[PDB]
Amino acid sequence: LSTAILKQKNRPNRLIVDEAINEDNSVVSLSQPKMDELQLFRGDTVLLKGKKRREAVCIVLSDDTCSDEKIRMNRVVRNNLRVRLGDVISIQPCPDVKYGKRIHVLPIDDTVEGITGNLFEVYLKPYFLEAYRPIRKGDIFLVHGGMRAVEFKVVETDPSPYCIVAPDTVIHCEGEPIKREDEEESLNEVGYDDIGGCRKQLAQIKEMVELPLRHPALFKAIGVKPPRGILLYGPPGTGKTLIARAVANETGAFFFLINGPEIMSKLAGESESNLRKAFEEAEKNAPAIIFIDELDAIAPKREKTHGEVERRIVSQLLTLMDGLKQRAHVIVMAATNRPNSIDPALRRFGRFDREVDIGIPDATGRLEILQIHTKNMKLADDVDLEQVANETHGHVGADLAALCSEAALQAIRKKMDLIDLEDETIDAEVMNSLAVTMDDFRWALSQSNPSALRETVVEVPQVTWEDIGGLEDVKRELQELVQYPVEHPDKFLKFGMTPSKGVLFYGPPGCGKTLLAKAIANECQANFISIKGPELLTMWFGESEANVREIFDKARQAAPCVLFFDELDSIAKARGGNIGDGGGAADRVINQILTEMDGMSTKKNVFIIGATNRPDIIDPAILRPGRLDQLIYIPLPDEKSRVAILKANLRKSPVAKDVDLEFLAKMTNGFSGADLTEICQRACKLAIRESIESEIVPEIRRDHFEEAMRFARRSVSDNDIRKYEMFAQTLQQSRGF
Amino acid sequence: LSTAILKQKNRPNRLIVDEAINEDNSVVSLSQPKMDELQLFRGDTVLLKGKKRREAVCIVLSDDTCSDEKIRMNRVVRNNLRVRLGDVISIQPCPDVKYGKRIHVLPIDDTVEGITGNLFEVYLKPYFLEAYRPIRKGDIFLVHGGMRAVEFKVVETDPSPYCIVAPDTVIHCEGEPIKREDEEESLNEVGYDDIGGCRKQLAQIKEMVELPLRHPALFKAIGVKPPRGILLYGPPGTGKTLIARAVANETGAFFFLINGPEIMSKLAGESESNLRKAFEEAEKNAPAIIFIDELDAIAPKREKTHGEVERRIVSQLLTLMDGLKQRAHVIVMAATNRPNSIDPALRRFGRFDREVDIGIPDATGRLEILQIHTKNMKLADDVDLEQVANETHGHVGADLAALCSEAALQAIRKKMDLIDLEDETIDAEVMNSLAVTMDDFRWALSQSNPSALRETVVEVPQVTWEDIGGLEDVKRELQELVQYPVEHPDKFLKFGMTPSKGVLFYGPPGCGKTLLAKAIANECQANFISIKGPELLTMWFGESEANVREIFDKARQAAPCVLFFDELDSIAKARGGNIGDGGGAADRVINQILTEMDGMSTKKNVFIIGATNRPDIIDPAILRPGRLDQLIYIPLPDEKSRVAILKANLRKSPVAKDVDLEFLAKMTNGFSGADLTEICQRACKLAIRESIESEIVPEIRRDHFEEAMRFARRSVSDNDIRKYEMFAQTLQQSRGF
Ligand SMILES: Nc1ncnc2c1ncn2[C@@H]1O[C@H](COP(=O)(O)OP(=O)(O)OP(O)(O)=S)[C@@H](O)[C@H]1O
Ligand SMILES: Nc1ncnc2c1ncn2[C@@H]1O[C@H](COP(=O)(O)OP(=O)(O)OP(O)(O)=S)[C@@H](O)[C@H]1O
Ligand SMILES: Nc1ncnc2c1ncn2[C@@H]1O[C@H](COP(=O)(O)OP(=O)(O)OP(O)(O)=S)[C@@H](O)[C@H]1O
Ligand SMILES: Nc1ncnc2c1ncn2[C@@H]1O[C@H](COP(=O)(O)OP(=O)(O)OP(O)(O)=S)[C@@H](O)[C@H]1O
Ligand SMILES: [Mg+2]
Ligand SMILES: [Mg+2]
Ligand SMILES: [Mg+2]
Ligand SMILES: [Mg+2]
């Protein structure tokens, strides 16, 4: 529903297109139910406006040879106003056009080859009947008389659209022939199809920028105020400038790009003139978008800036934003990788109220980025882009572009024996065979250093219930506590009881506390933010009191979310618990945590889960009803659940049929899930060593597990068993004394 | 009494108005007891000056068809100088007016439709008898001869008020016809009726700005000094600029708006000239208001500023404020969202002595904001604005405007199938059916991120005595301790004993310490500030020694107030109590608390309540007679009070008649109120799960409570019972050793 602006299904005005049995660009295919169903008379030349402000023209009425009804062109339009199937192109006539001047010869490379003579009677004499060359700026067509392999481009025209040429016109002979790079920048221009992994953010940008500008009457009639300040933020390299470049040519509004450093590079006084002229030029054209890339470069915080020119620039920008009234229809867009460094006076109502978060893409998002970036390369048949997307975790769009570049370079290194640096040229038999293979991508992955490794990942974890053995009661309770209020809120307000927002996991280590938190988020298809104990202790010593703010509201914007606080014992160990260092477990950090969970409304879908291995040193303040009142105990797996844990851990391992998992389950009494995983890993290491030794078979046999069972260490002692058991019944007693 | 300037009841010069049986704008209704009761002779044309500096004119003496005595017009004046019923419009004649020039034709859209010819004999020939078109700048009237559906506006006039036109006048033909947006900004101009939730602050602003300016003689005769500096402060987006815009057109004084960033955006030297010219222009006109929006932008603290131009600006502003003597009648108003960032030299006597606090509106306040903002939209019939106001808690006026915008956008997204982006227009059958429904508002509420969530809410809590089970003795004591000195202060000075200002709540956790503090504030209709333990520990580590100042005086200005200090054990746990970390519970923070409660006068209505679950680790210094000498013990609920607690918790739940609450009360011996609430919540979860399972009935039955009673955990142990009991008698012994 939120991305409804990007949906094109169930449209009766669209159809599928197939291959063409003919190979002639001069012909077009028509249909009776697409031409005789309206009032389009038999015109001479009609325009065909597709996407990216590009149109095309050909000879109409060139059909009644192939099938009717459905429409189908050749494959030459694969690079002309088309990138994929399923596009609706609005066809509309344009009669009563004016008459323009003529255009002289504009050769490219047709003089140093063959004979030329005059080069005038090969494109104007044979094509003058009912066709006066409806040329336009951006039209590419093939016309000649010697080999039919050269194109021609026009730059001389009085109006913007096409026109009918007329003879007997004087042309000033000062036209310089163009090079190749001037037109090669145009076809590969950035569009909406070059953005990968930002489907959700693109819908928001379209509905708050393009919609208020193309249809201001819709927003005016409904009595609403269209937002005039949009701030794109995210980690560096996520594609903020790419969206700017995409909307700079995919929108029918006057675009004005303002670079951050470019403004700040000017002298004192000359920079404010640039901002004033930019806003004045935008105000002149009613459809207008202003993009201020690198907003943090020109608008830092006025309480920690140094120079006076920066403060004057910030005040000038604030005045310019406030001075835009309603009738101008000017939308100011900005992009920064440091949204917290923006002056707070700018992220206020009426200036930059709207904020779009371009976060790190997930595996599905980055697969699309890889496909977009490799769409112009030549891959082999063994490349698996899904595998590359899965392996990359902290990678952003820039990181994926760098990875593709490194993979391409690795392919070049492999063919250095054939290429000669001292040679004037290199054979074409090795261009066409130069393909990037999967081993090239693996090598690039081996030393790709991602730039978003430290960033908190907000995604849906891949850990399902299948990865967790046993613990059915905990699964049912977690479902009834998280999945229930998010799918059936009507059952909760009827009974008048607010859902409990908060669960604490406690028990012996290595029992599935992290797996349960990830699985409950995976089943509900909700976001999951995992913040560990030591991560909070490191993140605060830099005297940053607001470092829990951007992680608590990060969950809030990603609703529904599961905010997991793993390894709380590490935090609690920093103060000793009851007496410790004099102060309780309520040290500098968790007090912020309690303040933040107290401030979150109960109607929100953000769920908070905490896990600890040391329930004796958690402060009682976190158990208060309203924060983490739900105390779910995670016991050691028993006879029945150990078989399930082993089966879950051995799902990806070729275990032979003779392995009796029940016997190993019954032999290990006080073994946690981590101990069983360690047993399986030791068995696999034994199998790997056996295979390597026997190389100078690829199945885990009974003896492999028998040998690994000998060294199996128990992680939880008998005394810890009784302590955890007596603590599973008296944890809520911690509040009071 | 404080808002007496906004009261209009018991006025004999007012009456109610009903609908009109006639539909003719050219007629007006008169009455004998409203026309023959004064000395108004039978004039030709009389003005009718309403509100917002707007007046209207029509043909007088057009009655004696409908009923007399009472007055009633048509519904066409619903947008002309009227927004609601109950308005008194001062009627006064204006004879001996001068004669002005003429006005040429000012067409709008009457040339591209129909026939025009001359367009002169359709508004001047048929209307010249005893009516010379008393036109004025801002008059809208309907006059034509073809369809009577076009209006006309004048801009050409020599004087300000209306005049009698005279023929044979030469007009310079240079008048450019006006567009639509130039007049569309005027009717929707901000007025006093566009302010929601600031009824109290508007009365203060009117009585310290409009009153001293409209009637300086009243202030001079009484021998008082009218304040000449008003500072509006509050959280961002609360409506400070909106009040500026409202007083800019609702007051009969020369308004001069000074923007903060607009001054600071000028060059060195040019900014001071702007301030000097602004003050000079204000001094020229005796009724004058100067508004300095974003005062913190131009007047930061001189001890932590960086540039010299800022210091020069601050000194110039100080000199300009001090240079205003008494006879100028110039009132300087300022608005900032950071009142603590203002230079302290400016918030002194004679400069900005008066301060008006525009805080976050309550539910009633924000309901009015929602009504004001949706007054121009088209809602459905299922929308409940009271529900939206109740659900929004940390929302301010800007947040509510954004929520309304998001709700309107959600409505547009639902109708994307009918609207066509490629179409040149869209059908009018979907404008009129485009209504925002309640589910649209629910979706907008699901991800509205309020900007005032961290702000300390100062409101009257909704927790009444009905929400608290039992504890009648504590209720009576709290009444006799808080409600008594605030309603009957005469009974206290007679006996000569000062009321005890301070109560400490101690006892086992989950017994109603927070509920009692909220209920005692709700019954007395007093404000309530809840500051928790961890909130104080987080709020101080940023090395902010003045962070308890703005919360203690916040209670002082909101008198009567109940300053609640909940979860004091979390504060006391930060030092260990008796020995702990060597220091006692008197750490960095509570020493400020004791200093602040020592400084508050006993005649104030601010009441301080503290609550703790660990009375063994509170320092004795807080129990000193004069701070929290009243030690109210909150015991565990007994047989009799548990039934009341269950009834209070089950007031909003459909419990069946077969549930015997006395039996569950007698079965749970050492159960706190939180334990009973948890039992009820578990029973409701069981009922919800049963209903969901049976879906593939909506009443809590006996078995639901029987099952939930099995897992009911006791929160307070037997040892804690005896410790709390022995501590309930010897808490005052803590002072001394
Ligand atoms: N979603 C994406 N889809 C496709 N290509 C992408 C995407 N994100 C990034 N890229 C590529 O990576 C490059 C990184 O540039 P940008 O991310 O646009 O720069 P930026 O977003 O302004 O971040 P900075 O420069 O560090 S502040 C882009 O120019 C693209 O080539
Ligand atoms: N119930 C289980 N089913 C399957 N594997 C499990 C289970 N419990 C633990 N494991 C294994 O043990 C690893 C650690 O799981 P965690 O959820 O992190 O345990 P924990 O209770 O959080 O304690 P630690 O301190 O994190 S080891 C998992 O990655 C699994 O390999
Ligand atoms: N009480 C209110 N009644 C009606 N509309 C309101 C109210 N408060 C805010 N608004 C709306 O929300 C917008 C917020 O703008 P303002 O609050 O006036 O700006 P501000 O008060 O100067 O706060 P800043 O700009 O963050 S310092 C207003 O323009 C109104 O549209
Ligand atoms: N007397 C009571 N009547 C009804 N509900 C109660 C009562 N006492 C406690 N509760 C419930 O328990 C919850 C907690 O109430 P509080 O006043 O916060 O208890 P407390 O004494 O302050 O101890 P904590 O640490 O806050 S749980 C309330 O929201 C109610 O749901
Ligand atoms: Mg950029
Ligand atoms: Mg873990
Ligand atoms: Mg303002
Ligand atoms: Mg409490």
Author numbering:
A (entry chain A), B (entry chain B): 12 to 707, 728 to 768
Original paper wording:
Despite varying degrees of differences in the ADP-bound state as compared with p97WT, all three mutants display essentially similar structures when the D1 and D2 domains are bound to ATPγS and in the state corresponding to conformation III of p97WT. This is not surprising since R155, R191, and A232 are all exposed to solvent in conformation III, i.e., no longer interacting at the N-D1 interface; therefore the mutations at these sites are not expected to affect the quaternary conformation significantly. The effect of the ATPγS-driven conformational change is especially noteworthy in the case of the p97R155H mutant because the upward movement of the N-domain results in the displacement of R155 by ∼25 Å to a solvent exposed face of the protein, away from the N-D1 interface. In the ATPγS-bound state, p97R155H and other N-D1 mutants with similar phenotypes may have an effect on cofactor or substrate binding since it is in close proximity to the site where cofactors are expected to interact with p97 (22). Indeed, the p97R155H mutant has been found to have altered responses relative to p97WT when bound to either p47 or p37 cofactors.
